[PDB]
Subunit: 359 residues, 2 copies
């Protein structure tokens, strides 16, 4: 099974990385144990959606391409290693973002930096190591692969887009004209930058490149199948599915219970440019806008409750259903376009969409 | 002149990175200005020793190798770009280490995260971007170069060694047998791990790979001159010069005035495994060891003054002069060995040593 193979490769990559630290980096057993626990705590426990997408894409191509059995195993092992590069990249982001945001919980457990024997002093460097491990994996497992350069160059571009998206995300509540390293950043009072286009820019860079584009293209690269798809369609369909995925997450941060969500949602307190805030501002009357301005971006629970009450009374379920119906049309249109060059890849995209649409 | 060329390339790399953010990453002018100021503040103001080493190594080879003028300019431009990759890598380290350590000053100015309009929330991601910029430079400027893969693989290995060295450094005051993510880390009471071999391990990984090995090998790679030197000698001479460089820094942290140093030294308060602490423990009597244990790793200025008094009374200048005389013998021995295959490269190493020995 796909999952069973994916998790087995985790054991092999972990053993490789820790054994190399022993043989080449003069690590002592206690520090190797610290790093093993750090890797398990930060990389495991999620659904592995991103990593599994590489595996699923590669499985789609194996079903229709002639290969020796040893080659089928090599491609699947490459898809698992590539999937783990993305999961470790995500682990790097989550560790650093939780420190950046002062987050309390992640995957129902404390954020890594909050573990007693970790602290921010270690955790920032642990997050750096998680990303360095992605490059050590690539150079070791893909040393002789024809796709090595394309995969490293794609991974680098996606990682950079993600860091730019993090900048767009954490500065989304400030007025662009007031950004200045020398001056403490006040929260916007006009919310003029809470628009659908600005929100789409945040999401495109902060989430879509590493969550959808990267696993899909990595699946194509380990399959030596990129010159079989129209890359502009892959980009357009990744950015559409990714935006939809983030809109679902934005809704959950506010309305999904803390136990089911795994963390207490703070987008309102943090004054984030969320789908709820943008969509609310896209339909509110003057009085509702004024009430939103007087309560948004404050830690005070009474003001948070006012914002949640404005969202609930604003019937945002109607806007969400209208957005969803539109995304369904556009995603189906793009899947259809993907069938011209590759019905196999289009089917993999259909599965990725189905898995996103239902969660 | 070498410096004039190096700084001119900074302008070109900066323009390239910011223009690409505009044309490909949908950046707005205010965020591009934030990032320009972040790049200038974190990358400029130092001596550019690491970056200049790549340039100097490449200049050494140009003096003895036949090339068209356009090729000489291309090699020098490649050496400057490669030098800037190392300076930006250092900038990434300094930004994250200052956050990790809660440092106040850097290069006589506040640490980046302390700027009013930055904050840790942005600065951790700014440090990530600085390292991502090193990869964007490499893929853009060296796209068609024969040395691209060797340079990227070397850079990745050095960066990973550095992050491992940071882990060794920040955990150097804890007992290895007590490292555990679940348990808050107490400072050692026995100081059994304050040994010359353990100190050499910290320094080798945290400093020597990125400060000496990387600039020397990058100089060889942009010169297409690696298969002209014995790589085991380059590694041995980089780790010797690097260790000497770090011992000088350790002495300065304690005895160099805060104004000349640029920051208030805190190695004693931080209980760092410094050359002074290891060397002191290598010659102290039982009473002196007991006094050191009762005062080391405490923020209290009276206890700090006791440790400084123990160091001053311990005549560590004698140990330093004996260490220096030994390093002089060994570095000269390695330079001599380097002349068998390349008198040109040995001369570049002699210059690197001279520049380290005098500062
Ligand atoms: Zn965040
Ligand atoms: Zn969220
Ligand atoms: Zn440090
Ligand atoms: Zn120091």
């Amino acid at each position: 099974a796909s999952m069973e193979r994916f998790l087995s490769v985790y054991d092999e990559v972990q053993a490789f990385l820790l054994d190399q630290l022993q043989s080449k980096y003069e690590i002592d057993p206690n520090r190797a144990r610290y790093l093993r626990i750090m890797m398990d705590t930060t990389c495991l426990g999620g659904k592995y959606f991103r990593g599994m997408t590489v595996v699923n894409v590669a499985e789609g191509f194996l079903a229709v391409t002639q290969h020796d059995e040893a080659t089928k195993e090599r491609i699947l092992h490459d898809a698992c290693v590539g999937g783990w590069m993305i999961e470790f990249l995500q682990a790097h982001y989550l560790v650093e973002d939780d420190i950046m945001d002062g987050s309390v919980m992640r995957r129902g457990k404390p954020c890594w930096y909050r573990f007693p024997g970790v602290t921010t002093q270690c955790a920032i460097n642990d997050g750096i190591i998680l990303k360095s491990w992605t490059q050590i994996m690539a150079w070791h497992y893909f040393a002789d692969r024809p796709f090595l350069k394309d995969l490293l160059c794609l991974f680098q571009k996606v990682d950079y887009a993600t860091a730019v998206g993090q900048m767009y995300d954490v500065t989304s509540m400030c007025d662009s004209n007031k950004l200045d390293p020398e001056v403490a950043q006040p929260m916007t009072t006009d919310f003029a930058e809470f628009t659908p286009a600005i929100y789409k820019r945040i999401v495109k860079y902060k989430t879509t490149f590493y969550t959808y584009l990267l696993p899909l293209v990595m699946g194509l690269l380990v399959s030596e199948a990129a010159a079989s798809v129209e890359m502009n369609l892959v980009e357009r369909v990744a950015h559409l599915i990714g935006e939809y995925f983030q809109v679902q997450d934005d809704v959950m941060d506010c309305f999904t219970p803390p136990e089911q969500l795994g963390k207490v949602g703070t987008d309102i307190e943090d004054a984030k440019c969320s789908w709820l805030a943008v969509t609310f501002l896209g339909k509110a009357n003057a009085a509702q806008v004024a009430e939103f301005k007087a309560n948004y971006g404050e830690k005070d629970p009474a003001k948070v409750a006012v914002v949640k009450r404005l969202y609930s009374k604003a019937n945002l379920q109607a806007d969400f259903a209208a957005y969803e119906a539109e995304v369904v049309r556009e995603v189906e249109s793009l899947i259809e376009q993907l069938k011209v060059k590759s019905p196999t890849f289009a089917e993999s995209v259909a599965v990725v969409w189905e898995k996103t649409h239902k969660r």
